[PDB]
Design a protein around this ligand. Structure first.
Ligand SMILES: [Mg+2]
Ligand SMILES: [Mg+2]
Ligand SMILES: [Mg+2]
Lengths: 80, 119, 178, 48, 136, 94
RNA sequence: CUGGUGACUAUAGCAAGGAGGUCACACCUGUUCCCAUGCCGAACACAGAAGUUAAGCUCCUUAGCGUCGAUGGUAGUCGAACUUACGUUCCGCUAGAGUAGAACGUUGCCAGG
RNA sequence: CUGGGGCGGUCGCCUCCUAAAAGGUAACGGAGGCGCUCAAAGGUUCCCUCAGAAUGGUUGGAAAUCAUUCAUAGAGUGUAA
RNA sequence: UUAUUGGAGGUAGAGCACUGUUUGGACGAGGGGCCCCGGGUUACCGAAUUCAGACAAACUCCGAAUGCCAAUUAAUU
């Protein structure tokens, strides 16, 4: 890599706040918050609202039930 | 699927283009350098007669030793020059073989110059 | 090297068992990742290309190579040699880090994410992914970005066929639409 | 090139060479190193 | 009226007419065909006249193949002009036919019908002709 | 399936013209088990034989003393004259 | 036999099938240094050797394609005689196309086995 | 100059065809260009290979930039051939 | 001058590998009149491809006869 032409890039810990999942990957993001790692080093921490672990599609969790059929809704609504 | 190029074929094309303007006469024989991942080979050649006057290589037992490839290259260059001196060859035209004139290839060339072969 | 470690151990084992590869060398691998942003708007305004370059530089962590038009097209008001795009080629550690982030963080951040298309293969075991916005990538900030812009991510694999490529990406944990 | 140019040696002032240039492309007086016979050495020659 | 849609050169040297036919001397698409025994230019008009005559007799039950195409343009000077001052304007399009050339091919009819149809065509054409069949 | 033939020497243009007028057809014999031989065959006899054997039918050729089974590899025909100008015979390995 | 480097119009190529790896050649492993990327150690360069014949590569088989290619005949044509015929005749030369066939190279020098 | 003259057209140079496989060869024969341009679009050294098509991919449409494969040149070569 | 040998060159003829011209077959990349994001089928099939057959002063994968240029070349003049 040419010197001085590339943005500063450093190992940072990406944390999923929802599921408390921590992984270390390179980024040009700088975080004031820094967290310890399994290895004897401390890296800046990037907090993620959602991640592969948390995201519904990845998990396959169904947040909402499927829409009822027209026959089903009719019977349920009027109790018939 | 991405194809991987054969490095020797690419350099050979480059060699052929160099060879158009470069040939070895008996008076001024061509010094060909072939460079592999592990070894460097040098031959002094007379193109008119299509004959090789002298040879030196890292794979040769005398030259073979534990050294960096550039260090070996210097040894090959010194060896070929001494052999050329025995055959009365003082003037040669350097054939880079299509390889860049840097590092190992250069070291062999420089060594031969220092030994007394005139480029 | 979390993604690389998985590839070296877990992924290699899965692929060689699946396709009965005689040699480890046969096992498919991702040669490179190229991120391409086409900016025809740059023709109208040079700044638009400059903003894109910065975004790509932040996303990939390496300076992009500006792409100049091969030919002039009147409809696009394009002149040959004009800068209309930027590209980055990611290789080695940088590639794995970007790919792991894409699957782990950037792809989740995609709005209304329903998985990536399974049909996005050239037929030669090479996969191209299109991102609607660069806001999905974690580094990019919404305040900083004046205009939301999409990107093309091309993942080049040594795999001869798409099916082998699909397995490699699935082993990496790439989401698929199915 | 739209105009004829005469290059004069800076040292001796000799108009050793004549050349052509595009005035719009090269508005300034062009300068280049040229062999000067009187000096018998290469010298800067500038358009008059 | 058969004619080339475009040509690189509208004014061309007139074709050599001496010699024998280079190609198309065998019936290849039909059961029967008309063979030229003499040399002449064949105009687009002549082809059409011969074609219309043969199709009418055949009643369109059979299929007609026109082997010759009028590729070459020919020029004519404006009337009452002196010589020189350039070549004239294109007047027509012609095919050079030499002895042996099959002008037309017919199929989907009995020989008797074909012989009459080709006879009717022959009378519209400058060259002398002979009725011919596929040879094996 | 048998037709007699006669061998030929070096021929001038006039000779071949006289041969075709006589009704004989110039021909050559080549293939497996035979060196190239230039031969002449009567047109009428050839036509009768080929009708019997067909276009690709094997024919017995009386090439001098020897008899060689041959096939018509190719033939040259004059459409205007309705005459076969030349015949190529290919020897068939048996 | 292998490799380097030359000669030759592809009969030498392409494609398809198969085989091969102490050495050699690669792929490969890294980027500390020389050196490098209009971004990228991809390449180039260099330092190496954990792994691998997968590929390249080398070898073998083949005639599908490409290439080569007769003999015979034909077109054309020099000359001559005859003619004015979209000609004829004789003599010499003699294609193109196509056909049989050839062909999955042949070799020089140097260093290893 | 001129298939009489006038009128019209033309006049130097370059490329092709006519031109009859050396060269040369005419008509008011058939076609086109030139009266420049470039300070690199010159020199040298090193490095590199196209057009097009198919497929995958967002702004992006037949066609922009990206990727793979095929592609022997159908590209390019300042400007006619 | 002829014989012998070597060479330059692209005409006649021929051919369609290129650039154009062209006839008859099949055949479709991809949707419209047509029958379902849930499939079909009686234009165009224009892209393209393929088989067969023709054309060219300014087309050429080819390619003569002659003519031309030569030869420490022989015969005759
Ligand atoms: Mg000439
Ligand atoms: Mg001539
Ligand atoms: Mg001709």
């Amino acid at each position: 890599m040419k010197q001085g032409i590339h943005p500063e890039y450093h190992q940072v810990i990406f944390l999923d706040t929802t599921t408390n999942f921590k992984f270390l990957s390179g980024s040009t993001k700088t975080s004031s918050e820094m967290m310890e790692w399994e290895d004897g080093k401390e890296y800046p921490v990037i907090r993620l609202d959602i991640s592969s672990d948390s995201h519904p599609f990845y998990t396959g969790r169904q947040k909402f039930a499927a829409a009822d059929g027209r026959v089903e809704r009719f019977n349920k609504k009027f109790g018939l | 699927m991405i194809s991987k190029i054969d490095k020797n074929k690419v350099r050979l094309k480059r060699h052929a283009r160099v060879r158009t303007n470069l040939s070895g006469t008996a008076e001024k024989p061509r010094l060909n350098v072939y460079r592999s991942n592990k070894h460097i080979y040098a031959q002094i050649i007379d193109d008119n007669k299509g004959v090789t006057l002298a040879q030196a290589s890292s794979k040769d037992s005398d030259i073979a030793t534990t050294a960096t490839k550039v260090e070996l290259a210097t040894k090959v260059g010194e060896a070929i020059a001494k052999k050329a001196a025995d055959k009365g060859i003082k003037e040669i035209v350097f054939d880079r073989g299509g390889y860049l004139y840097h590092g190992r290839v250069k070291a062999l060339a420089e060594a031969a110059r220092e030994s007394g072969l005139e480029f | 090297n979390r993604l690389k470690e998985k590839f070296n151990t877990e992924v290699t084992e899965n692929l060689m068992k699946k396709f009965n590869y005689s040699s480890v060398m046969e096992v498919p691998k991702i040669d490179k990742i190229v991120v391409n942003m086409g900016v025809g708007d740059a023709v109208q305004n040079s700044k638009v290309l400059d903003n894109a370059v910065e975004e790509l530089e932040l996303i990939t962590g390496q300076k992009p190579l500006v792409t100049k038009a091969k030919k002039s097209i009147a409809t696009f008001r394009l002149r040959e040699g004009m800068p209309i795009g930027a590209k980055v080629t990611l290789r080695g550690e940088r590639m794995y880090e970007f790919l792991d982030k894409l699957i782990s963080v950037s792809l989740p951040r995609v709005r209304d994410f329903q998985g990536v298309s399974k049909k996005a293969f050239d037929g030669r075991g090479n996969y191209t992914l299109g991102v609607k916005e660069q806001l999905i990538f974690p580094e990019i900030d919404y305040d900083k970005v004046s205009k939301v812009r999409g990107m093309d991510i091309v993942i080049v694999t040594t795999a001869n066929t798409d099916e082998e490529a699909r397995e490699l990406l699935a082993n990496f944990g790439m989401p698929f639409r199915k | 090139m739209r105009v004829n140019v005469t290059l004069a040696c800076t040292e001796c002032g000799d108009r050793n060479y004549i050349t052509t240039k595009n005035k719009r492309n090269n508005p300034e007086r062009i300068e280049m190193k040229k062999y000067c016979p009187r000096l018998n050495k290469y010298t800067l020659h500038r358009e008059t | 009226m058969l004619l080339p849609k475009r040509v690189k050169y509208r004014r061309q040297h007139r074709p050599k007419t001496t010699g024998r036919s280079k190609g198309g001397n065998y019936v290849t698409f039909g059961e029967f065909g008309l063979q030229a025994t003499t040399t002449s230019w064949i105009t687009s008009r002549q082809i059409e006249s011969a074609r219309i005559a043969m199709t009418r007799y055949m009643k369109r039950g059979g299929k007609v193949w026109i082997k010759i195409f009028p590729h070459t343009p020919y020029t004519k000077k404006p009337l009452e002009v002196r010589m020189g001052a350039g070549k004239g304007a294109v007047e027509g399009w012609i095919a050079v036919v030499k002895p042996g050339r099959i002008l037309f091919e017919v199929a989907g009819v009995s020989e008797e019908v074909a012989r009459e149809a080709l006879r009717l065509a022959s009378h519209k054409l400058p060259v002398k002709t002979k009725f011919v069949k596929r040879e094996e | 399936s048998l037709k007699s033939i006669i061998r030929q020497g070096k021929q001038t243009r006039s000779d071949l013209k006289q041969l075709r007028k006589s009704g004989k057809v110039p021909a050559v014999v080549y293939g497996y088990g035979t060196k190239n031989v230039s031969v002449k065959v009567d047109e009428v006899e050839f036509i009768k034989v080929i009708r019997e054997v067909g276009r690709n039918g094997v024919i017995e050729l009386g090439v001098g003393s020897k008899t060689i089974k041959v096939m018509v590899a190719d033939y040259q025909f004059d459409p205007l004259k309705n005459q076969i100008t030349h015949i190529d015979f290919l020897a068939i390995n048996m």
